[PDB]
Design a protein around this nucleic acid. Sequence first.
DNA 1: GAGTAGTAAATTC
DNA 2: GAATTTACTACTC
Length: 69
Amino acid sequence: EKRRDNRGRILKTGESQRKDGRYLYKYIDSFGEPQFVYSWKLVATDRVPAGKRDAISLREKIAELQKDI
DNA sequence: GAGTAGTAAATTC
DNA sequence: GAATTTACTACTC
């Protein structure tokens, strides 16, 4: 069973979407307290409704959490 | 640990 | 000027 985004792609565990359609990636840090990461573009290729603050794709943020900073 | 819904505060075109 | 985003928790499995 694999959930998908508001389109037809495939989101991996840990990733998901809130009620605003924006993507949301929750992940328990080595502290024991869930962490919220928000974004609108799943990959640095999509766009973002005018009025929203530009940002890298959540995939670019996750990459930082996997590396170090 | 994974996810949702709801909120508290500050910010933007 | 108005509307909007971010962050954490509470409960759930």
